[PDB]
Amino acid sequence: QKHRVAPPPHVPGHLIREIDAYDLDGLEQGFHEAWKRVQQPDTPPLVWTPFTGGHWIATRGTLIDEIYRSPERFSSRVIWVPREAGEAYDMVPTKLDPPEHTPYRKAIDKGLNLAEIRKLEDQIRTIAVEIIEGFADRGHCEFGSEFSTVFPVRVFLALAGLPVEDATKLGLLANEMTRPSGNTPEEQGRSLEAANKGFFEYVAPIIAARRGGSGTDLITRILNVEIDGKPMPDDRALGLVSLLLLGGLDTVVNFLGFMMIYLSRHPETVAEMRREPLKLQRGVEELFRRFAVVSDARYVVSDMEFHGTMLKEGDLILLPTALHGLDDRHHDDPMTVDLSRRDVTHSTFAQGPHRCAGMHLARLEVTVMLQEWLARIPEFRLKDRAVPIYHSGIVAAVENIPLEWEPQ
Ligand code: HEM
Ligand SMILES: CC1(C)[C@H]2CC(=O)[C@]1(C)C[C@H]2O
């Protein structure tokens, strides 16, 4: 049973579209495919759905890019739908606009900048190799449970100086953050609230212990960056460390599954990567263009007209980042991975002040994964008649990816 809200007076009927971000029409055929259905050749750049509490959806790449770049007009004070979940959401600095956002992003960048990330390459590689060598000779694996949900999680927990045995409870919190349970805005609000509380509970003692700490881990490094010449307050720290865990554990995991499904169905593309190692390295960004997973929102700051549509202060606009990288108006044949594509522009990492702090880590993880995978499992296919199971929400997910190959 679908929960509908009535449209507010300023939304005209001709812009209404019944789109459910948490269970997209056509989702069974794929998350990206399902979002692509929304983007028909004549659909308005902004449409409004009565589902998920009622909100706008930007349907074209340049709107998504522009909105992300314009925090003075589109605020991060709510970035989740439904509104109830967005209001309960308590992560730092994603809830902040500049200038409040700025010193916290600086602190994060101390830990996640490209030069710091580069130092991590061999640890990441070691982790990838160990996992791959566990099944490489077997000739088959369930990629989701045996790799994609394992590799990035071990990478991040090691980097964060946390026990790997916490992976399960943290993954469960992550699920209810990005894909909250419930068939009602209030239910989803409550699911998110409880998940966000679980993160704060887990994170509090770690913060207490590592303040002024000597540890070399990501959390200690970032925690002890001063904010305006003072220790980071408790309220902000809780939201900050929770966000690190959330990004580190429930992004790359999902990205990898979508990517691998595609690769397993395009052996020519895999062959190219194999034969030209530089095509692989330089081609990773094209993968990020093609396999966006995040759909989040911004809060309309003032009554305005935007791309010919009237918006009211407080309106939420969902930004399905897949609709930038896959916009046929930005990229010819957007659904094909072309490793040589010169223009790979996308909003997979969003834009503006909040542009993904973890993007260097994400790029390295994927680059290393592909290098060590192809070295040991050069050819592979999706099992005959296998059907991956897809989930849509603030972050997309996919499971059931049985791969098969002839051991080399
Ligand atoms: C496939 C990989 C990833 C994707 C697609 C992705 C996507 C995004 C997006 C779209 C945003 C902007 C959210 C918004 O403000 O509306 C973001 C921000 C952020 N991400 Fe990533 N992310 C990925 C990996 C990571 C990783 C591994 C981390 C490690 C901690 C991370 C940490 C962060 C942080 C801390 C922010 C907030 C930055 C700020 O508000 O200034 N991300 N990410
Ligand atoms: C939307 C995000 C992917 C982004 C901000 C969030 O809350 C995430 C779920 C983790 C971080 O990387």
Side-chain angles (χ1 to χ4, degrees), residues 68 76 79-80 89 92-96 101 104-105 108 112 156 159 218 240 243-249 251-256 288 291-298 319 321 347-351 353-359 361-363 365-366:
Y68 271 134
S76 280
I79 63 152
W80 239 244
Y89 180 94
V92 171
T94 40
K95 72 179 182 171
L96 300 174
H101 165 266
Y104 287 94
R105 177 53 182 259
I108 293 179
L112 290 184
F156 194 84
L159 170 66
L218 188 66
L240 190 287
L243 178 59
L244 292 176
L245 295 180
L246 187 56
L249 300 184
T251 57
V252 182
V253 161
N254 298 306
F255 176 85
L256 285 176
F288 283 107
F291 309 105
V293 293
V294 176
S295 310
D296 64 6
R298 288 295 185 272
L319 308 171
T321 61
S347 293
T348 293
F349 295 128
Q351 312 285 344
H354 296 276
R355 197 167 66 111
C356 177
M359 72 182 178
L361 177 53
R363 287 165 176 163
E365 282 192 50
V366 168

Side-chain angles (χ1 to χ4, degrees), residues 7-84:
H10 68 279
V11 171
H14 79 267
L15 295 179
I16 305 187
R17 296 292 186 282
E18 300 193 327
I19 303 169
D20 179 355
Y22 285 103
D23 187 24
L24 292 165
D25 189 37
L27 185 57
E28 68 280 351
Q29 319 205 320
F31 170 79
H32 299 92
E33 289 78 2
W35 269 120
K36 277 295 271 185
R37 284 187 190 267
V38 170
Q39 189 178 71
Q40 308 190 316
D42 304 328
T43 116
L46 249 5
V47 297
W48 185 92
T49 173
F51 296 144
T52 322
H55 61 88
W56 293 97
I57 298 177
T59 71
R60 286 294 169 176
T62 112
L63 275 84
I64 289 160
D65 173 81
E66 187 180 2
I67 285 172
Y68 271 134
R69 290 174 187 268
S70 319
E72 284 187 70
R73 294 177 304 158
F74 306 100
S75 171
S76 280
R77 64 181 279 182
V78 181
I79 63 152
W80 239 244
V81 290
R83 187 181 303 273
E84 291 79 355

Side-chain angles (χ1 to χ4, degrees), residues 275-343:
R275 303 182 315 245
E276 293 181 48
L278 262 41
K279 238 190 182 51
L280 186 164
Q281 291 174 24
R282 296 162 177 160
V284 170
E285 203 63 16
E286 162 77 342
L287 301 177
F288 283 107
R289 179 199 64 83
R290 174 62 176 80
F291 309 105
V293 293
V294 176
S295 310
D296 64 6
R298 288 295 185 272
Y299 175 106
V300 172
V301 169
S302 290
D303 286 8
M304 70 189 306
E305 184 171 4
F306 187 66
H307 289 257
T309 125
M310 299 311 299
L311 302 178
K312 248 50 187 173
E313 172 178 340
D315 282 358
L316 304 186
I317 307 177
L318 186 75
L319 308 171
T321 61
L323 295 185
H324 183 182
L326 308 182
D327 196 333
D328 46 295
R329 291 167 192 185
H330 282 262
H331 302 291
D332 297 349
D333 308 311
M335 299 306 282
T336 117
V337 167
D338 173 8
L339 293 172
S340 307
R341 192 184 292 276
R342 223 303 159 189
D343 182 353

Side-chain angles (χ1 to χ4, degrees), residues 144-174:
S145 56
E146 293 188 80
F147 190 87
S148 63
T149 64
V150 181
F151 162 68
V153 173
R154 286 185 190 170
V155 167
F156 194 84
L157 297 177
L159 170 66
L162 295 165
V164 69
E165 17 284 303
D166 288 338
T168 296
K169 56 208 264 210
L170 293 177
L172 291 177
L173 294 183

